[PDB]
Design a protein around this ligand. Structure first.
Ligand code: NI
Ligand code: NI
Ligand code: NI
Ligand code: NI
Lengths: 570, 100, 122, 570, 100, 100
């Protein structure tokens, strides 16, 4: 007995060789391999396979290779591959990627993926499953930002801030031991993973280091606090000792140096360069040349992504408003004209496509959109396909190489840069079960269900008074993972090794899972998955033209994007 | 008024439908959430009018046509479900493939 | 009688900044090919290497401009600026690591500045 | 180099001699003094002063005279003065009022106000900063009342209630040890300081006192529970032993006595007389004469403030509704006509202006508006300026004397009456950092940011999905101070000394800061800042005319108020 | 806008009144929450118009009559209370037995 | 509909603008929150219409004039900022000194 492929995909989701359109883009992903045994697919419901004696084992206790949760028939899109599998979760972690069910009667069951009495089931057939997004450029300004992030599939927020204080409104910084302690305590109530950055500023080690010992998970060097050679140096000496990452928003004004001076102060040490294109800040006009260097882990923020016809008008005015500029102060219009450049924004699209900018991020509420990191990543990939063609590395008509290159920018790469990829950032065995299910029609736009630590935290679901959950109004809502003390077991607070060894969690009464930041100082550009290109980026000081390997990098702005007016109410 | 949780939520569907209707009246091709809001509010007001579940399953397929909406919107909407208080209590209405 | 909610009604007069402190005028040139903008409170001797001026005249001083404002030098631009004296303990730490102590140690500051290529020493 | 005053104020906020209009009132406040050093003003941002090596010190650790938070360039309006300063906060308390920055290079830096690595910055330039309001007449009826209070700059709620039970809907009372324990536990989740009043009723000491030992912070004597000579006496004997305050809503009906009988039962002991004018309740018609006595700390509630053309019609009907009166019961219309009196409401405006009524309060949800204490205080001051002229004590054309008199009514005076002024009620060194920033255009109407224990708790802030926090919709929202366990460190539960000594906090698992109520029994009218007048208030029993020093106190009702239809959507 | 908690809530009363008014215009006898919303919004808009508390206590009794509403609705509504910002600040209006 | 947090919030701006427009139509001088709501909704609907950011920065200054609003309102509104989904994605529009 045979099933035609259209009917097969309708019932169980796609299989080897089938392609799926990403939302309303022109991007198609292709199933590379499938872990199932045709005819022994797992499925749940009235009269279906996962029933006692059948696809559900009736013999084994939970500890005997039985899962807490099985996601059936997922189409995984990850740096590791684009493929079809069941995902098994236990104790909050991904423990098996393969084929779930009962070894009594099915062939090919992965040995620790038994569906038993203890197992909950999520049907992922017809859904695309990705890792939760890792946003490493978050300003903690307004707690309403968390649901915004969750709704677009973000599960980890790394950054800083104390609320709507001017320091935090400008910089991803939670300054000093007391503010850090207070925000670790606030974090107990946020339904998302969090890591906190201290102020990467000072000329003595102690004032900087005491933040790391207090519970910070990294540092931020920002020009608003003085991105001088000294603060750069002292922060990287602390980071190399503490094994945490340093981010930088460099001196736009070139006050104490040009880009080469900041690179000299870095002295080959690893650093994460935020909004590397420079509209979001940094040495004018040539900060984007940071993305060519081996010791630099380069991210973009999202307002410039991708280059559209309203971008320049919007950014010139945004900068006037947020940086308080006056058109009647000649220095302020020169400053703006030196910072907001179509030449570097157009090239940024192409540097993403080439794998020279490795990461995406938001810059949430300071100069970036909390719920648009994932969104704008796929809009950029789609624009690049249209303008540059399918990459050369594509095969058999799919956009899989491009899709793996771009999914890495907001999942595994930020996690590696931050020293947290042992816990999150990808759909791999042994990693925390932060998983996002997407309907293909909404892929990258609005998440279906967001799983945090193995329990659904956020979902698009309807009328709570209805007979079934699908009637209107269907909207994003917090689920049982966010309620009561379950918010503690489903989320991770990432902290330095020294704060953990000094017993900060117990001191402050932290109940969240505590994650250790490690292995951040011996990495480089070569460790950024699918985005590991080092090259000499030349930015002309007069014209702002960007060249890589002797060629000018330019592309046009687009008038329309997918993942836009077809979906949003406003 | 004694508003319960569902009454408060469902007011927002009416509002979204008023918004969408104004958008349609000034000549715009409607998008996904706009189309869903219009058809959903139509069902709930139909229930309030005292129509049957069977009348609204029929009528719901003629509220918006493909020329009213953006490319792809018809195919994005497999069905629209809404519960409202009919003369005989709360009932569920599902309009299947509302826009052909 | 028109009311502007929350409006000011400022007193008469002007506010003199950095009153009683010595003022010094110096010529400064941006010899580089990118713009440099210098804030009110940076120890002037520790600014970008490519700004050419008499570095000794920047020691223990900063720009004599309203707090939080800046002077801008376009690529190749030379102009005069007015400096004022640093106050408090007249000590500078960090920044470009040229001072790290009293601003009175002019010979040490200039030796470090010259060795690191900060243009204009002597 | 000199800056003109208009430009100076635009950049750094006003300085000595400059005046600022309070919202859309006719009230002008004048800067009396300024702690800055002209040219070394602190300010934060791209290329600004608070940067490492410059206005931010790069050397000192947090414990070495470094602040957790600096509010730059605040215009303080407080009983202590109307003046310009930086405010430094550390460990949740105000530790310095003066000049912040770096002693390396700035003149005049207050020694414990160093901006260092550990310091967060709030820009207060162009803002008016006040203490958080102290509302000592709160009925705990509906938890949605807390955001209402926060939005109009209230940071402490003293009163009682268990929710929408009739006892609590009528009286500020949380009765008995069990209800008190339950509400102390509920208080753990309210983002505002709280003090709980027990039932000030009984004829034996034990039943009353056991409430104080259970965790109450004071008592309420209310006519609905029997405001008899015995309950008055027993409550004040308990209060004198326990060192807590007693409030009273006296016997309107004169059942067991007239005002002189209630004064005889008080017997010279200190007491807080609520809604002293009497529309809100008390011996008809002459309860307002309480405000002349030395042992009485007198407050108004807010519906009568100030006297307007709709006041009488509104109050007659409000009383009919809330007191369940029938127009067909002659006793009920006589009761209403004896209680709601234009003669005493008009005089109440003038008694506030003279400093004879010392405090304002809400009567939230029982006969008063939770979010209008601050609002109506300034409307009253504005009405009095128009009708009576600038006070005689004014100088050089400002309304500073009036402004200090009126700000005291909702800040320091309620705190002194309650025995909590060692912790809150004013912007002074050594007091808890409960601070409210106001844009002058919104002063007294809608707070910009409310700081609780040094962390922003509530703010008017915009779209959480936007690139910057200022886009619409700008609305009042809870901030990170209210989330997780940070709600415990930013708020105070005020309790009696005996409950604290008996270990109630530990018994109940209270995690909030615990504040001690003390020094409430040896104070009097003379201790009410700027509002310390004792005099013989005569209220004519036939005509209800009020006389002070032989003169009739009368003024007209107004048809329009400022801080009204220009601001509110409804 | 600087919306406070009450301003946000009271927007929803206006919306419920717009909904009810549309229901009345297409010929329906109004129900309990619909009648309360119409009269409440009338009071709040009256305050915004600058009417007195006394004018609105009078006018509120003539907004809806018993023929406008379902059987029993008049007797279910003993009074309607609303606070709004008049020219002289927030005041409470109670309309007693609004529908005879 | 799949409403996200911002979509739900921004519906309330439209509603406030509908309220304000009704107030203006019956002859009232508009207040601060009313003026902000009208101009904000104009920007968001303009984005939905497919206008550019530059067109809306121009047009936003002609939506309300000083005679439309209460004394002091023009000077209270330094600018109005709104983000909406244009044909090319979310963009920020700031209208500077909208009411002269
Ligand atoms: Ni930045
Ligand atoms: Ni940032
Ligand atoms: Ni009372
Ligand atoms: Ni009361």
């Amino acid at each position: 007995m045979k099933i035609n492929r259209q009917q097969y995909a309708e019932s169980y989701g796609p299989t080897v060789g089938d392609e799926v359109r990403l939302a309303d883009t022109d991007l198609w992903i292709e199933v590379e391999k499938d872990y199932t045994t045709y005819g022994d697919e797992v499925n749940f419901g009235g009269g279906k396979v996962l029933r006692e004696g059948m696809g559900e084992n009736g013999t084994y206790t939970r500890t005997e290779n039985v899962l807490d949760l099985l996601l059936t028939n997922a189409l995984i899109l990850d740096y590791t591959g684009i493929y079809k599998a069941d995902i098994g979760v236990k104790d909050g972690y991904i423990v098996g990627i393969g084929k779930g069910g009962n070894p009594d009667i099915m062939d090919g069951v992965t040995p620790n993926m038994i569906v038993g009495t203890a197992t909950e089931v999520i049907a992922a057939e017809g859904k695309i499953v990705t890792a939760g997004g890792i946003d490493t450029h978050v300003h903690f300004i307004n707690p309403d930002q968390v649901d915004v992030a969750l709704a677009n599939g973000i599960t980890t927020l790394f950054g800083g801030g104390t609320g709507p204080a001017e320091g935090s409104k400008a910089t991803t910084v939670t300054p000093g031991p007391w503010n850090i302690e207070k925000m670790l305590k606030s974090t107990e109530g946020l339904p998302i993973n969090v890591g906190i950055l201290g102020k990467g500023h000072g000329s003595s080690i102690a004032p900087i280091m005491e933040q790391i010992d207090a519970g910070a998970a990294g540092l931020k060097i920002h020009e608003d606090w003085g991105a001088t050679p000294a603060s750069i140096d002292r922060s990287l000496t602390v980071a190399d000792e503490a094994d945490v990452q340093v981010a930088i928003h460099s001196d736009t004004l070139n006050e104490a140096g040009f880009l080469e001076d900041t690179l000299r102060a870095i002295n080959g040490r690893v650093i994460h360069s935020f909004h590397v294109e420079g509209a979001g800040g940094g040495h004018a006009p040539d900060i984007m040349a940071m993305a060519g260097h081996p010791n630099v882990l380069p991210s973009s923020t999202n307002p410039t992504r991708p280059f559209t016809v309203n971008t320049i008008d919007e950014h010139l005015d945004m900068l006037m408003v947020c940086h308080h500029l006056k058109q009647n102060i000649p220095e302020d219009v020169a400053f703006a004209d030196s910072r907001i450049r179509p030449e570097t924004i157009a090239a940024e699209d192409i540097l993403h496509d080439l794998g020279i900018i490795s990461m995406m991020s938001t810059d949430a509420l300071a100069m970036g959109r909390a719920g648009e990191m994932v969104l704008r990543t796929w809009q950029t990939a789609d624009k690049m396909k249209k303008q540059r063609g399918p990459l050369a590395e594509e095969k058999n008509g799919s956009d899989n190489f491009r899709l793996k290159r771009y999914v890495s920018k907001y999942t595994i790469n930020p996690a590696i840069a931050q020293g947290i990829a042992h816990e999150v950032g990808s759909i791999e065995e042994g990693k925390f079960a932060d998983l996002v299910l997407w309907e293909p029609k909404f892929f990258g736009v609005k998440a279906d269900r967001v799983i945090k630590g193995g329990i659904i935290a956020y979902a698009q679901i309807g009328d709570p008074s209805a007979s079934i959950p699908t009637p209107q109004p269907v909207m994003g809502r917090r689920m049982y993972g966010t309620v009561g003390d379950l918010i503690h077991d489903t989320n991770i607070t990432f902290m330095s090794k020294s704060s953990i060894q000094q017993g900060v969690p117990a001191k402050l009464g932290l109940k969240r899972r505590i994650g250790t930041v490690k292995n951040c100082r011996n990495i480089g550009k070569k460790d950024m998955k699918w985005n590991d290109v080092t090259t000499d980026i030349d930015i002309n000081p007069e014209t702002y033209e960007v060249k890589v390997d002797g060629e000018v990098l330019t592309c046009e702005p687009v008038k329309e994007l997918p993942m836009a007016q077809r979906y949003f109410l406003f | 008024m004694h508003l319960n949780p569902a009454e408060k939520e469902k007011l927002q569907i009416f509002l979204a439908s008023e918004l969408l209707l104004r958008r349609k009246a000034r000549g715009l091709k409607l998008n996904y959430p706009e189309a869903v809001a219009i058809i959903t509010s139509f069902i709930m007001e139909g229930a309030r009018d005292g129509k049957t579940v069977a009348m609204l399953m029929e009528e719901g397929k003629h509220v918006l046509t493909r020329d009213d909406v953006m490319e792809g919107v018809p195919e994005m909407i497999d069905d629209i479900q809404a519960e409202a208080t009919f003369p005989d209590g709360t009932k569920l209405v599902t309009v299947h493939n509302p826009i052909s | 009688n028109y009311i502007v909610p929350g409006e000011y009604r400022v007193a008469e007069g002007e506010i003199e900044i950095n009153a009683g402190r010595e003022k010094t005028t110096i010529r400064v040139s941006n010899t580089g090919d990118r713009p440099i903008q210098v804030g009110s409170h940076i120890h002037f001797v520790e600014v970008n290497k490519e700004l050419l001026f008499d570095r000794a005249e920047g020691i223990g001083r900063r720009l004599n401009i309203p707090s939080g404002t800046a002077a801008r030098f376009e690529p190749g631009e030379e102009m005069e600026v007015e400096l004022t004296e640093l106050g408090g303990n007249r000590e500078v730490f960090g920044i470009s690591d040229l001072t790290n102590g009293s601003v009175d140690n002019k010979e040490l500051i200039l030796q470090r500045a010259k060795e690191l290529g900060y243009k204009g020493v002597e």
